[PDB]
Amino acid sequence: QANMGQFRAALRRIMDDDDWVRFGGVLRTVRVKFYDARPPDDVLQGLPFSYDTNERGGLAYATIKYATETTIFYLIYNVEFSNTPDSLVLINPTYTMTKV
Amino acid sequence: QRPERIKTTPYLEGDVLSSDSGPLLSVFALQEIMQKVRQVQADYMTATREVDFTVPDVQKILDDIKALAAEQVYKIVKVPSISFRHIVMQSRDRVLRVDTYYEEMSQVGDVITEDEPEKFYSTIIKKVRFIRGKGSFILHDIPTRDHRGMEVAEPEVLGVEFKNVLPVLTAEHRAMIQNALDGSIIENGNVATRDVDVFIGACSEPVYRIYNRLQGYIEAVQLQELRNSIGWLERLGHRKRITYSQEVLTDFRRQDTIWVLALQLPVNPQVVWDVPRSSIANLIMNIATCLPTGEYIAPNPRISSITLTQRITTTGPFAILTGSTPTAQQLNDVRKIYLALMFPGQIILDLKIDPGERMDPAVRMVAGVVGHLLFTAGGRFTNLTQNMARQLDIALNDYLLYMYNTRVQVNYGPTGEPLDFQIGRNQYDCNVFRADFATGTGYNGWATIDVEYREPAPYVHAQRYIRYCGIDSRELINPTTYGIGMTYHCYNEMLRMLVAAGKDSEAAYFRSMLPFHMVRFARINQIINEDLHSVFSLPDDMFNALLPDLIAGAHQNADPVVLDVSWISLWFAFNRSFEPTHRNEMLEVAPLIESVYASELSVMKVDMRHLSLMQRRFPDVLIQARPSHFWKAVLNDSPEAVKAVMNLSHSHNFINIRDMMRWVMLPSLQPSLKLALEEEAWAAANDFEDLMLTDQVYMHRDMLPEPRLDDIERFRQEGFYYTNMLEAPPEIDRVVQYTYEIARLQANMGQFRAALRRIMDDDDWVRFGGVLRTVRVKFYDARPPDDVLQGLPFSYDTIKYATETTIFYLIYNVEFSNTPDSLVLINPTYTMTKVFINKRIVERVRVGQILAVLNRRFVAYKGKMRIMDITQSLKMGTKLAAPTV
C-alpha cells in the first residue's frame, strides 16, 4: 500500500468506518500507569507505528516500523465544589487510539 | 548474528595464528605464478622474445573500473549546432549554401595512404567515433517568443545561419523571408501544462539518425527495466544470504524527472569467458572481488593430551612436530594449499624439492598419511598432480612398513607397485589406497558424491554445488548424527588400516581429531558455495572436462595452474582451519563492475567485426593488411582499465591470428546504451561517401571558362562559379577503366605517360577506380595556385596511386573598370582532375528557397524538467517494496 501510495488513506478510511486494526502478531511488553489529571499527548493519541519517506538520487524510499511497547493507563476524575454542572463538556471530543 | 558462528563447547575454540584476505591473496597468487616462470627461464637456456613479467596492483584497477561507470555518453544542450552556412557573391538574388558536416568531416582523420594499414584503420575508427560524439545530445530549455497570439521558435535554435545574407537583398525578399521565418511554430503552444516543445528545424542525416535513436532509447527504458535489475540483485543476495535494512524502494516517479539508465544487471556470462587465454585473469578477479576475510585458528591443545593428575600426563605421538614453528616459506606454502583447496579444478599442487634443506625422515612419512585424508583425486575433479599422488603413495608405503614397535605379519604381492601387500593378523588389503584417477579410491571421494545439483542458480553458467568429504554446511545448524558418529568412508578405512598395522596411538589421535577436520571442510564448502559465486567462476562444461583431459593428456583451453609445496606444509595445514570474520569490502559492488567490463568487451568486439570486412570490400588498399593491425587499432582507442583487466597475465604477448579470428566471429553480445549508439553510428558510416572517402575520380582535359563582360550588372546578377565537381558521371562508352595493377605495370615499363596523353588528346575520360582517396573542399575568390588547378591523381616518388585531392569552388568577381574582353588570354589554362560525389555538399540556390531546408522534427524538454542518471543505484543491498516475479 505504501508502494501504491494508499497507506495513510486506507488507515483513515478504516478508522472512519468504526473498525479495528491489528499490526502483526509479535508479543509486546505491557506497562501500567496511573494518572490523576489529563494524561500527556504521548500515551494518549500516539500512533503504534512509524512511517518515513526519503529521496536519494531521484529515487523514493519508504520506511515502515512497528512499535514494541504499549501502555495500560487508568484515569481517575477529581472534581471540586466550585465546578459547574457542564464544566467537563468540551465542544469537540478528545480521541484515544489504543486498546489492550 | 550468524547462527553457525555460535560456539557452546570449547572444542572448537582455539588460538589465532594469522589472518589473510582477498586483496592480499590475489597479488600473492600472481607473484607466485610469475616467479615460477622467471626462475625456470633463468635456470636453463631458452630462446624466445623478451617479455617483462611484472605484477600490477589489482586494487587500483578495480577502482578505475568502478569509476568508469560514472561517465556519460550524452550531452545536454540549449541549441543544436549550426549545420548550414551561406556564401554570397556580388549578386543580390542568388547565393550558395554549404553543409558544414562534410567540411568538418574532411579534416577529422589522417590522410589515407597506400602502405600503412594501421593508419587506415585508425582513421576509420576516429571517423565513426566522431559521428557518435556529434550525434548524441538532448535539447533542453530552448528560447521561444510570443507572436500573433502563438509561440514561435527563435531563429537561434534553427540549424541555419543566414544573418549575412539580409543586408544585400531588396525589400520584397526581406518581407518574404521575414514572413517565412515567422511561420515556424511550436505545436500545441496554446495549451498549459504542456510537457515538451515540438518544432521543425534543419539538420543533417548522419547525426539526425543518432538523435532519433537516443530519444527512442530514452523513451523505451523506464521503470520496468529497473525493477527487473533490482529483482535479479534480490535473487543473488538471497543466495549469498546478506542482511537487509528496513528501508525499501518505491516505484514512485516525480512528474518533473526523467530517468536515464545505461546498464543492465543479468549479464551474459559467455562474454566474460569468450576472451582468448583469460582463465588466470578470471581466477584473479574472482579472488579479488569475492573472497571473504578471516583468520587461521589452531585446534584446542587439550585434544592431544589430558592431565589425570598434576604429575601425570599422556603424551601424543607427534609431540615433536607440534612444538615446531613455521618459517616464512612454510607459511606461504600453507596459503598455497588453502588456495588450492578453495578452487577445486583450477589450482593443482605439486611437490617441491630443495637440496639445501635438511629434515627428519619422519616428516615425510607423517605427511604421507595426512595427504591421503586432506586432498581429493576422485572421479569428478582433482587437487593434485599424478606425480604428487605417486609421491604420497610411496610415503604411505614407507610409513606402513616402518615398525618401531613389535613387528607384524606382512605378505607381499606379485607386482612391484607400492602398497601391494596384506598386513596385520587380519589380512587387510592395502591395494585400495593406491591412486586411480578413474574412480579415486585412495583419497576423499572414494564412495561419496562430491558434486551435486540443487536449484537453478542466479548465474546460469555455474549450477554445481561442491560437497567436500560428503559433509553439508547445514550440518553446522541441524546435525543428522551424534558427535561420535561423524565420519566418512576414506577416514574410516584409514583408521582401520592404521589399527591393523599396530599403530594404535596414531589411530587414537586421528579419531580424536576427526570432528575438527569435518567442521573445517564444512566451512570450506560454505565459503565455496555462497561467497565465491560469480561470473568469473568456471562454467560447468569446462569443469566437467578438466579431469578427462588431464588423464588423457590432451589439449586444454583452461589449463590449471600448478603450485609447489613442501613436506611439512602438509602437517602445518592439517592443524589449521579458516574462520571467516567479515565479508569482502566490495562484495555489494561487484555486479556493476562485471556489467561495465562486459559492455566494454562487447563494444570492442563489434568494432573489430565491422572492421574485419574492409579487406574483402576493397582489396587494392589493404594489400599488407593483418588481423593484428586492426586489433591494435581498436585497442589503441579503448579505456585503459579494461585492457589492464584483460592483460593480468601478459596474454597479449602470446595470442596469434587464429585466436583473434575465432573471437571476432563468436555471436555473444551484451546490450547497453553505448552499444546501441555504436551500432547506429556504424550503420550510418557503412556508406563511404558519408566518411568523405571515394573512388569516383576522373581525368579530362577541360578549359577554364572566360566569359565576355558586355554588361557588368547583368553578369553580376547571373552569379557565376566554376567547379570540378561533376553533377553526373560520364557515359560508359566514353570512359576507360584503370586498375592499380595495370597502372603499376605500365609505369614500370615506362609506357604510362604516353598512354595517358594518347587518351587525353582523343577527348576521352579515364577513371582511377579501385582505391579510396581523401577529399578536401576549398573555396577560392581569385585565381588559385597552379599546383591545385593542375593537380594529378597520382604522384611519382614507382608511382603512388593514392593521393589526397581537392574539390575547389572558384568565384568570379568583376569591377566596373574591366574591359569587355579583359580576361581572355592568348593561350588556354587546363584543369584535369574531376570528382563525382552523390551528395549535395554545395548548392547554388535562389534567395526564395533559403528556408527550404527546415524539414526535420525536434522534440525538446521544457525548463522545469530534470535529467538524472540512476545507474549508480544498482547496489546489492536494495530491496524493493513490491516484489517482482
- Spatial separation of the C-alpha atoms in residues B327 and B569, rounded to whole Å: 10
Determine phi and psi for B452, rounding to 5 degrees. Answer: -135, 175
State whether B868 and A65 contact (CB < 8 Å).
no
State whether B870 and A64 contact (CB < 8 Å).
no
Report which residue type is found at B62: L
b (16+ CB within 10 A) / e for B663-688: bbeeeebbebbbbbbbbbbbebbeee
- Which residue in A61, A63, A64, A68 has the most chain B C-beta atoms within 10 A of its own C-beta, making it the best mutation to test that interface? A61
Give the DSSP H or E segment for B492: helix B489-500
Q: Which of B247, B254, B868 sits opposite A61 (nearest CB)?
A: B247
Radius of gyration of chain A (CA): 19
Q: Where does residue B267 rank: exposed (0-12), middle (13-18), buried (19+ CB within 10 A)?
A: buried
Min CA distance, B869 vs chain A (Å)? 8
Asked if residues B808 and B780 have their Cβ atoms less than 8 Å apart, the reply is yes
* CB atoms near residue B790 (< 10 Å): 12
Chain A residues inside the 8 Å CB shell of B248:
61-63
Asked if residues B871 and B261 have their Cβ atoms less than 8 Å apart, the reply is yes
Q: Which residues of B681-772 form beta strands (DSSP E)?
A: 693-694, 697-703, 721-723, 725-726, 735-737, 765-767
Report which residue type is found at B474: R
Q: Which of A2, A58, A60 sits opposite B868 (nearest CB)?
A: A58
Experimental method: cryo-EM
State whether A57 and B872 contact (CB < 8 Å).
yes
- Spatial separation of the C-alpha atoms in residues B153 and B180, rounded to whole Å: 12
Strands B765-767, B735-737: pairing kind: parallel
B49 and chain A in contact, CB less than 8 A: no
Min CA distance, B137 vs chain A (Å)? 21
Give the DSSP H or E segment for B338: helix B328-342
State whether A58 and B882 contact (CB < 8 Å).
no
State whether B252 and A5 contact (CB < 8 Å).
yes
CB pairs under 8 A between A and B: 39
b (16+ CB within 10 A) / e for B551-582: eeeeeeebebbebbbbbbbbbbbbbbbbbbee
Q: What sections of B136-246 are H helices per DSSP?
A: 171-182, 205-220, 223-240
* CB atoms near residue A17 (< 10 Å): 7
Question: Bridge-partner residues for B562, per DSSP?
Answer: B348
Chain A residues inside the 8 Å CB shell of B881:
2-3, 62
Asked if residues B97 and B86 have their Cβ atoms less than 8 Å apart, the reply is yes
Q: Which of B257, B872, B881 sits opposite A2 (nearest CB)?
A: B881
Query: For cell 500527556, what's the residue?
Result: A40
Question: Bridge-partner residues for B67, per DSSP?
Answer: none
Q: Minimal CA–CA distance to B731: which of B701, B764, B708?
A: B764
State whether B259 and A3 contact (CB < 8 Å).
no
Contacts by B840-843 with C-beta closer than 8 Å and gap 24+?
B840/B99, B841/B98, B841/B99, B841/B102, B841/B725, B841/B777, B842/B96, B842/B97, B842/B98, B842/B99, B842/B723, B842/B725, B842/B777, B842/B809, B843/B96, B843/B97
Contacts of B122 (CB under 8 A, 6+ apart): B109, B110, B633, B636, B637
Which grid cell sits at B744?
A: 603499376
- Spatial separation of the C-alpha atoms in residues B232 and B458, rounded to whole Å: 8
Min CA distance, B884 vs chain A (Å)? 13
Packed helices B590-611 and B279-290: angle between N→C axes, nearest 10 degrees? 160
State whether B870 and A63 contact (CB < 8 Å).
no
What does the H/E/C string look like for chain A?
Answer: CCCCCCHHHHHHHHHHCCCCCCCCCCCCEEEEEEECCCCCCCCCCCCCEEEEEEEECCEEEEEEEECCEEEEEEECCCCCCCCCCCCCCCCCCCCCCCCC
Q: Which of B248, B254, B868 sits opposite A61 (nearest CB)?
A: B248
- Spatial separation of the C-alpha atoms in residues B458 and B591, rounded to whole Å: 12
B870 and chain A in contact, CB less than 8 A: yes
Query: For cell 511550436, what's the residue?
Result: B186
Which grid cell sits at B756?
A: 595517358
What does the H/E/C string look like for B405-447?
Answer: CCCCCEEECCCCCCCCEEECCCCEEHHHHCCCCCCCCCCECCC
Packed helices B361-374 and B489-500: angle between N→C axes, nearest 10 degrees? 150
B54 and chain A in contact, CB less than 8 A: no
Chain B residues 217-256 with a CB less than 8 Å from chain A: 246-252, 254
3-state secondary structure of B817: coil
Radius of gyration of chain B (CA): 39
What CA–CA distances, in Å, run from B529 to B234, B288, B666, B746? 17, 17, 30, 73
Gaps in chain A after residue (C–N beyond 2.5 Å):
none
State whether B252 and A64 contact (CB < 8 Å).
no
End-to-end CA distance of chain A: 26
Give the DSSP H or E segment for B613: none
- Which residue in B229, B245, B252 has the most chain A C-beta atoms within 10 A of its own C-beta, making it the best mutation to test that interface? B252
B872 and chain A in contact, CB less than 8 A: yes
Contacts of A3 (CB under 8 A, 6+ apart): A62, B250, B251, B252, B881, B882
Q: Which of A2, A59, A65 sits opposite B246 (nearest CB)?
A: A65
Question: Bridge-partner residues for B33, per DSSP?
Answer: none
Q: What sections of B527-589 are H helices per DSSP?
A: 540-552, 567-574
- Spatial separation of the C-alpha atoms in residues B109 and B105, rounded to whole Å: 8
What CA–CA distances, in Å, run from B626 to B118, B607, B629, B665, B773? 9, 16, 5, 16, 21
Q: Where does residue B195 rank: exposed (0-12), middle (13-18), buried (19+ CB within 10 A)?
A: exposed
Min CA distance, B193 vs chain A (Å)? 22
Min CA distance, A27 vs chain B (Å)? 20
- Spatial separation of the C-alpha atoms in residues B239 and B218, rounded to whole Å: 33
Which grid cell sits at B344?
A: 577445486
What CA–CA distances, in Å, run from B702 to B707, B761, B790, B833? 15, 11, 11, 9
Q: Minimal CA–CA distance to B331: which of B519, B687, B678, B571?
A: B571
Concatenated DSSP letters of B796-815: E--EE----EEEEEEE----
What CA–CA distances, in Å, run from B435 to B60, B108, B141, B392? 44, 67, 77, 9
- Spatial separation of the C-alpha atoms in residues B64 and B94, rounded to whole Å: 57
Determine phi and psi for B580, rounding to 5 degrees. Answer: -65, 145
Question: Bridge-partner residues for B85, per DSSP?
Answer: B98
B484 and chain A in contact, CB less than 8 A: no
Q: Minimal CA–CA distance to B671: which of B234, B228, B231?
A: B228
Resolution of the coordinates, Å: 3.1
Give the DSSP H or E segment for B61: helix B58-68
